[PDB]
């Protein structure tokens, strides 16, 4: 199918249901459809910089928008979690993060913060010619990784060169962002990882208020150490 009804659109864009008959369908890209933010909604229905899709198209042909340091001209380009949107004409850098409500919240960041992003390690394996590499949550293949990097770790990637500057292991006491379930957008420190082999691993997380909640490991993204996040939080 090539058409998406506004009501049938998943929940997280915050789009009003009655604006029109159809909503933008995210195109193929780094992120899955159900957790992506196409540039049209980000520019029009969140920032309001544009009033209509045609104005958005003029904006993108002007090459004023950069996603992760690269100019994108597709209106429905699927920006997602830990994506840096740079607007040089106006001097803004934005990082896409879920809010406690579970919507993407437009968070201003510094240029140093813009220069890098964080990627959860989804897979680590040896490529052709015996070259190890890592696949992150955004589909980025990075070769010659540090040996200590494993699955469920988080790697700090420099956008300009796309290389690994530092990494965080998945361990108890680490600071964590929830990217799914009811707890989506919540932040807390790991307590215990409960393992079911052949099944979905479960992680217990305690917030700063001492409240505890359990979530599947797939919705877990390490973002730093307790009290020392590597990214600016909303």
């Amino acid at each position: 199918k090539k058409h998406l009804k506004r009501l049938a659109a998943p929940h997280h864009w915050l789009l009003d249901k009655l604006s029109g008959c159809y909503a933008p369908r995210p195109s193929a890209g780094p992120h899955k459809l159900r957790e992506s933010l196409p540039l049209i909604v980000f520019l029009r229905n969140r920032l309001k910089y544009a009033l209509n899709g045609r104005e958005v198209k003029a904006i993108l042909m002007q090459r004023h928008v950069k996603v992760d340091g690269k100019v994108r001209t597709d209106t429905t380009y699927p920006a997602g979690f830990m994506d840096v949107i740079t607007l040089d004409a106006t001097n803004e850098n934005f990082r896409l993060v879920y809010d406690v409500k579970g919507r993407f919240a437009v968070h201003r960041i510094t240029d140093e913060e813009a220069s890098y992003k964080l990627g959860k390690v989804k897979k680590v394996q040896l490529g052709k010619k015996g070259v190890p590499y890592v696949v992150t949550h955004d589909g980025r293949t990075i070769r010659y990784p540090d040996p200590n990097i494993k699955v469920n770790d988080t790697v700090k990637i420099d956008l300009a060169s796309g290389k690994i500057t530092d990494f965080i292991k998945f361990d108890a006491g680490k600071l964590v962002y929830v990217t799914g379930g009811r707890n989506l957008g919540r932040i807390g420190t790991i307590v215990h990882k409960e393992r079911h082999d052949g099944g979905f691993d479960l992680v217990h997380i305690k917030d700063s208020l001492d409240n505890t909640f359990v979530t599947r490991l797939n919705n877990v993204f390490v973002i730093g150490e307790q009290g020392k996040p590597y990214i600016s939080l909303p």
Binding site: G102, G181, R182, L184
Partner: peptide, 16 residues
């Protein structure tokens, strides 16, 4: 078995 699926009706306000 736990479904582990978000539900829109639970989040949305039902005050009216």
């Amino acid at each position: 078995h736990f479904e582990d699926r978000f539900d829109a009706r639970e989040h949305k306000d039902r005050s009216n």
